[PDB]
Amino acid sequence: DIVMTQSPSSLSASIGDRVTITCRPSQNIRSFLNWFQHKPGKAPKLLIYAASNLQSGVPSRFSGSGSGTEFTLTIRSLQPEDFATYYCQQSYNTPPTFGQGTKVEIKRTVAAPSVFIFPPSDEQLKSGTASVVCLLNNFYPREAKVQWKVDNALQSGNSQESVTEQDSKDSTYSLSSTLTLSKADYEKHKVYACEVTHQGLSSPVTKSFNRGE
Amino acid sequence: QVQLEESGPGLVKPSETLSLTCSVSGVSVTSDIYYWTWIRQPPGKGLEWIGYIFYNGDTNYNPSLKSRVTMSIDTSKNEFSLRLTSVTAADTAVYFCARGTEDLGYCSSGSCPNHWGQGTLVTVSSASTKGPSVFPLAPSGTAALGCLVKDYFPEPVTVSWNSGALTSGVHTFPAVLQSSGLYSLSSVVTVPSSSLGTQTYICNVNHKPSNTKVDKRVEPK
């Protein structure tokens, strides 16, 4: 019932940068404010309790300040492993409530993706469907354009993308694009191609195969 | 200093009751200095605190949920549990158990969960479980290969390589929901091209909701 307003919702910063996240409760909570870190698929971890007390085992670059109705989490020197979503949590009145979170991403140098294309397996074709997969490996930044072309005709509406979370050591992303076709449509064409445009590529990179070669 | 192992069904039908258990190791659930908490997070939504329970009997549940939730402690098993009635799609979420240490100088009672479990996803749906079909992403200095894990429900699947021996260079993509209502993902790994002739690569796909385990060899051609 106490509403926690966190800001910003998301930020990007370079390694070594000083990062600042604020939390404002809807009423005064004295010093009863905790800060959490949540890395993807890991247990959320308590970083700071009672506004300014560093939890045991947490690196000293994390620090909390403030009281009353304004609180700040500072990351004094951003490290690659600090990619995570951070939350404030008031412990003043029940029920405990959380801010909606701040997504922290790492800015780093441009890294072009390595590109791979995979044809559908013969085992899948017996099912009546053909999946064609394109892989973009270990790139930065996250933005990339991936176009499917079948006999050089541009595809639309029949593919889905998925992106990994930012890597905790090299801060890169990887991305899959999957083209789904009926077996009948797959056998009507020859050249299957994934064309990749990315800031690290001076011109687009195309990977292709010919069905049945 | 504490380990918290969560268990329970990952699929619950609408209007039925969701039950989860947290197995505690390293301290006793009868120790009066700790309290035990559940928290949840729907996909893409915020965290919602559910409640706390002390062994001495004192409890407090979020007013949003108090009329549907109970918690209990099983001393013989050193466990505690969550019971949530009459579930709907709003109850689809990752559920976290957590321990806190009572300390009124730095926290109101029962309000600072400081050791959390890693969470378990519960999906509320009338659909049955379905195990995945697994297809090779065959390799064409560095080569890429993988496994396509198609048409399963609900999440999650786990993917390992070479029974867990191969970890360097692996990317397992987040699942995507297909228009069919079933999930799909791929797991890839980059390896030396010089290895393709003599190293065997197998992806191991585990889908606990369907008690399904599938091994797929991934080779050239």
Side-chain angles (χ1 to χ4, degrees):
Chain A
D1 178 82
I2 296 188
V3 177
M4 311 294 288
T5 298
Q6 253 182 265
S7 68
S9 56
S10 148
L11 64 94
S12 298
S14 298
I15 298 307
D17 285 352
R18 187 177 190 90
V19 172
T20 287
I21 297 163
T22 63
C23 182
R24 288 183 184 265
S26 62
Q27 71 190 75
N28 190 289
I29 62 173
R30 312 278 187 96
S31 300
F32 286 181
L33 184 279
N34 311 314
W35 288 101
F36 288 93
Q37 173 191 61
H38 186 203
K39 304 183 181 173
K42 309 309 284 187
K45 175 175 187 54
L46 176 71
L47 304 170
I48 302 174
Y49 64 96
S52 59
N53 303 109
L54 184 67
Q55 181 77 347
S56 283
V58 179
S60 63
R61 59 173 182 279
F62 292 95
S63 57
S65 59
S67 63
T69 189
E70 172 172 356
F71 304 81
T72 298
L73 171 63
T74 301
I75 311 175
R76 298 182 168 175
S77 60
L78 231 216
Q79 300 297 128
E81 64 262 36
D82 298 338
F83 162 74
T85 297
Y86 297 83
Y87 300 89
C88 60
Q89 176 242 320
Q90 66 89 14
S91 59
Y92 185 69
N93 296 140
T94 55
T97 46
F98 296 82
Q100 293 308 300
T102 299
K103 192 189 161 78
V104 168
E105 314 95 33
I106 275 66
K107 252 287 169 299
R108 56 150 285 164
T109 56
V110 172
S114 303
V115 190
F116 307 85
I117 192 178
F118 297 101
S121 65
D122 294 343
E123 303 98 279
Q124 184 190 21
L125 293 180
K126 302 194 296 281
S127 78
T129 298
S131 303
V132 200
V133 176
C134 181
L135 202 224
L136 284 60
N137 208 32
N138 299 345
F139 60 98
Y140 191 86
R142 185 185 201 250
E143 289 75 18
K145 183 164 49 162
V146 174
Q147 314 175 79
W148 282 104
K149 293 185 302 185
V150 181
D151 291 323
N152 234 12
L154 179 57
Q155 304 299 288
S156 71
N158 54 3
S159 62
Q160 301 181 277
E161 299 187 348
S162 179
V163 189
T164 60
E165 304 281 352
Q166 189 162 39
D167 181 275
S168 74
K169 297 186 58 193
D170 68 15
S171 308
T172 59
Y173 300 92
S174 297
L175 177 155
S176 71
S177 184
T178 303
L179 175 73
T180 303
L181 303 176
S182 66
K183 171 184 185 178
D185 279 334
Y186 175 73
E187 306 281 351
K188 284 191 286 195
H189 302 281
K190 172 95 102 56
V191 180
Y192 289 85
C194 171
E195 179 172 356
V196 174
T197 296
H198 183 267
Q199 164 174 349
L201 300 173
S202 58
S203 49
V205 164
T206 295
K207 298 303 187 201
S208 314
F209 65 87
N210 301 334
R211 176 184 53 74
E213 294 194 4
Chain B
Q1 198 252 31
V2 65
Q3 278 172 1
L4 294 175
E5 178 176 2
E6 305 181 38
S7 62
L11 179 59
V12 182
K13 287 190 282 210
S15 80
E16 295 194 9
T17 293
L18 167 159
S19 298
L20 289 181
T21 297
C22 188
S23 182
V24 172
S25 304
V27 297
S28 178
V29 297
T30 60
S31 182
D32 54 38
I33 68 162
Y34 304 117
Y35 51 89
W36 309 94
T37 296
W38 292 90
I39 314 109
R40 67 181 187 173
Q41 188 172 35
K45 303 275 181 297
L47 288 151
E48 177 181 33
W49 182 88
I50 298 173
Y52 70 67
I53 176 173
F54 285 84
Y55 175 61
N56 80 342
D58 295 337
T59 62
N60 179 284
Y61 307 132
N62 194 325
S64 70
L65 292 160
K66 175 179 179 62
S67 65
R68 292 197 291 146
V69 299
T70 58
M71 294 177 199
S72 60
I73 294 171
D74 182 331
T75 65
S76 155
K77 304 185 164 183
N78 214 57
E79 295 178 348
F80 64 102
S81 296
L82 176 59
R83 199 181 182 265
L84 175 67
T85 71
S86 203
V87 301
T88 76
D91 299 308
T92 295
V94 178
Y95 288 78
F96 304 90
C97 61
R99 188 192 83 183
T101 297
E102 191 77 330
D103 189 359
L104 300 177
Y106 298 100
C107 192
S108 78
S109 178
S111 297
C112 292
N114 69 335
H115 297 288
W116 298 35
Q118 64 180 42
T120 186
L121 176 65
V122 182
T123 297
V124 173
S125 174
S126 63
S128 73
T129 64
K130 178 179 182 316
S133 308
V134 180
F135 306 110
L137 298 170
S140 182
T142 297
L145 57 100
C147 277
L148 174 63
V149 180
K150 192 156 165 108
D151 295 339
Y152 60 93
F153 187 86
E155 301 192 83
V157 299
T158 65
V159 183
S160 64
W161 284 90
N162 287 356
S163 287
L166 179 62
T167 58
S168 293
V170 176
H171 295 296
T172 302
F173 287 94
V176 298
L177 180 55
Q178 308 168 105
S179 53
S180 58
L182 307 175
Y183 290 94
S184 179
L185 63 76
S186 288
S187 180
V188 299
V189 65
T190 55
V191 301
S193 301
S194 64
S195 81
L196 296 176
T198 53
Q199 175 67 253
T200 300
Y201 295 106
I202 293 166
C203 72
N204 324 102
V205 183
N206 285 286
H207 187 240
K208 298 180 280 66
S210 65
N211 198 30
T212 296
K213 309 182 168 268
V214 172
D215 300 317
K216 194 42 136 276
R217 186 185 293 250
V218 182
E219 62 196 348
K221 151 97 68 183

